Design a protein around this ligand. Structure first.
Ligand SMILES: *[C@@H]1O[C@H](CO)[C@@H](O)[C@H](O)[C@H]1NC(C)=O
Length: 246
C-alpha cells in the first residue's frame, strides 16, 4: 500500500507520495530506462491500495489496477463504491470484501463518462492539493453528481502524476492554491497509452517511433515526439502501459 496526508503537505511530501506510488507498480523489465508495466497479474495481486486523508484527517482507500494505473473503486467508511465496468466488478471480487453494502456508481471510470456525470469538463475543474482535500471530503458521503467531479480531481492528482514527472511538478506548484490544469497536463494524460506503445515499438526500430505523438509543452506550445532522445522520454514519462493491454 501507499499513503498521502493533506494535513501539513508541502511540495516535498507530495513528491514523496508520487515516488512511492510509482515504486509500487511491478515490472520485470525497463525499456529505454523506463519501467514496463506487466501484461497481467492474477488474483488480488492485481490491485494496489492508496490511503488518502483530507486536512481534517478523514480518509478513503482507493483500489488501483497495477497493470494500468486505473482506479477501480474506493472505500469510504463502510460503503464500497465501484465504477460500473467489468474490470471493477472483477475487482469487487477481491477488494473491500468487508464493506456493508456495495454501491455501483452510475458511471464507468473513464474521463468522458465522468465529465458528463459531473456537469463540466476537467479543463474547468481546479486541481491542486486544496482540491484533493475537497475531493476526499465529497467522496465520504454519496452524492453521485458531486462524486464525479471529485473523482476527476483524484485521478489526476494520483495516477496522472505517477505517470508523468511534469504533472507531478504541476501539482507541486498548486500546493496552496488551486488552478485548473495546464494545457500540457491534459495533453499528457490523453497521450499516455500512445506514448507507452511507441516507446515499446522503438526497441527494434533504432529508438524511432513508428508513429509520432503530438503534445503541448511547458510554455503552452506544440511539440511533436519522434524518438527516444526527446525529453518527454528521457525526462518525463515514468511508467509504460504494456502493449498486451492496448
Ligand atoms: C529525435 O529527437 C530530437 C527531438 O528531441 C530531434 O531534434 C531529432 O531531429 C529527432 N531525430 C530523429 C532521427 O527522429
Amino acid at each position: 500500500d501507499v499513503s498521502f496526508r493533506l494535513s501539513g503537505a508541502d511540495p516535498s511530501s507530495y513528491g514523496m507520495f508520487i515516488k512511492d506510488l510509482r515504486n509500487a507498480l511491478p515490472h520485470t523489465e525497463k525499456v529505454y530506462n523506463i519501467p514496463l508495466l506487466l501484461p497481467s497479474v492474477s488474483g488480488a495481486g492485481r490491485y494496489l491500495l492508496m490511503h488518502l486523508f483530507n486536512y481534517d484527517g478523514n480518509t478513503i482507500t482507493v483500489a488501483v489496477d497495477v497493470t494500468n494505473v486505473y482506479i477501480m473503486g474506493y472505500l469510504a467508511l463502510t460503503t464500497s463504491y465501484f465504477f460500473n465496468e467489468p474490470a471493477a466488478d472483477l475487482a469487487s471480487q477481491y477488494v473491500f470484501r468487508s464493506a456493508r453494502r456495495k454501491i455501483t456508481l452510475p458511471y464507468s471510470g473513464n474521463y468522458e463518462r465522468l465529465q458528463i456525470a459531473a456537469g463540466k469538463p476537467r479543463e474547468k475543474i481546479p486541481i491542486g492539493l486544496p482540491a484533493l482535500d475537497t475531493a476526499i471530503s465529497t467522496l465520504l458521503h454519496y452524492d453521485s453528481t458531486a462524486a464525479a467531479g471529485a473523482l476527476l480531481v483524484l485521478i489526476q492528482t494520483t495516477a496522472e502524476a505517477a505517470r508523468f514527472k511534469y504533472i507531478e511538478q504541476q501539482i507541486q506548484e498548486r500546493a496552496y492554491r488551486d488552478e485548473v490544469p495546464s494545457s500540457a497536463t491534459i495533453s499528457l494524460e490523453n497521450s499516455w497509452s500512445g506514448l507507452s506503445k511507441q516507446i515499446q515499438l522503438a526497441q527494434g526500430n533504432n529508438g524511432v517511433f513508428r508513429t509520432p505523438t503530438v503534445l503541448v509543452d511547458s510554455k503552452g506550445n506544440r511539440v511533436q515526439i519522434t524518438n527516444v532522445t526527446s525529453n518527454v522520454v528521457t525526462s518525463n514519462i515514468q511508467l509504460l502501459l504494456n502493449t498486451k493491454n492496448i
